[PDB]
Each structure stands twice: as C-alpha cells, then as structure tokens.
Amino acid sequence: MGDVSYIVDSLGLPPFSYQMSLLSFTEKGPQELLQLLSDVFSTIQKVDVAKEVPDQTADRLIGFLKIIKYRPNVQDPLLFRQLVAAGDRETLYQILRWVVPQAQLLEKRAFVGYYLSFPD
Numbered sequence: 001m002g003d004v005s006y007i008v009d010s011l012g013l014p015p016f017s018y019q020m021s022l023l024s025f026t027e028k029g030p031q032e033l034l035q036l037l038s039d040v041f042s043t044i045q046k047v048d049v050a051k052e053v054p055d056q057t058a059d060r061l062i063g064f065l066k067i068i069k070y071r072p073n074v075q076d077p078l079l080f081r082q083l084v085a086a087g088d089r090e091t092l093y094q095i096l097r098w099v100v101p102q103a104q105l106l107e108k109r110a111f112v113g114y115y116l117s118f119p120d
Helices: 003-011 022-026 030-043 054-067 077-085 089-099 103-111
Strands: none
Touching (some): 003 089, 077 089
C-alpha cells in the first residue's frame, strides 16, 4: 500500500469500471489474485484458474507479461515463476500496480484488427 489504492482506483476506470473497496482487495488471497490478474488480461479467452494447475497459470501470465514488456523486480526468472505460481502478495501487487494503470492503452493496442469493421 498504497500500491493497493492505485490498483483499486485503476479498476474503477475503463475497461473494468468495477468498484472494489480498499479492504475487499487486501482480503484477497493467492488464488483470487491469480484470478484477478487472469481476468485483467482477459479484459485487455477468460479462464477459471481452478481449472488450471498453478504451473501453467504462471507460464500463461508470464507469457502475457513478456508480450507487454514487463520488467519484473525479481531478476531470477525461475524465482519469479514460482512466486507467480504461489500467488505471492508483493509480486502480484507489483504486477497489478504496473499493468492496471495503462490498461486502457494496452486494450486499445490489443483490440486492433480483431474486428472486421476495424482493420489493422
């Protein structure tokens, strides 16, 4: 905190426009958070994380992060992996804090050429 308030404020804007309380957020454990990251990425195919094993969850989100050019704080690729898989609070807050603001920009760029009426 208040990485938290930054993240929460960003979720109340587009493309999420969802009101989450400072408390409700911090009450989220490892799996709710991996879901949240997963759902954030889907807003920008959605996935119920309880239908995945945490090792391909990690890789899948790591794959997406490399796409958008995320520089993790942890410089050990495999320690980052496992921290993602374990849903570490600080690691996840770190990612969410970087990604969620600028989601409107990430979405605009992701949305491009998808729809026939809106060519690349």
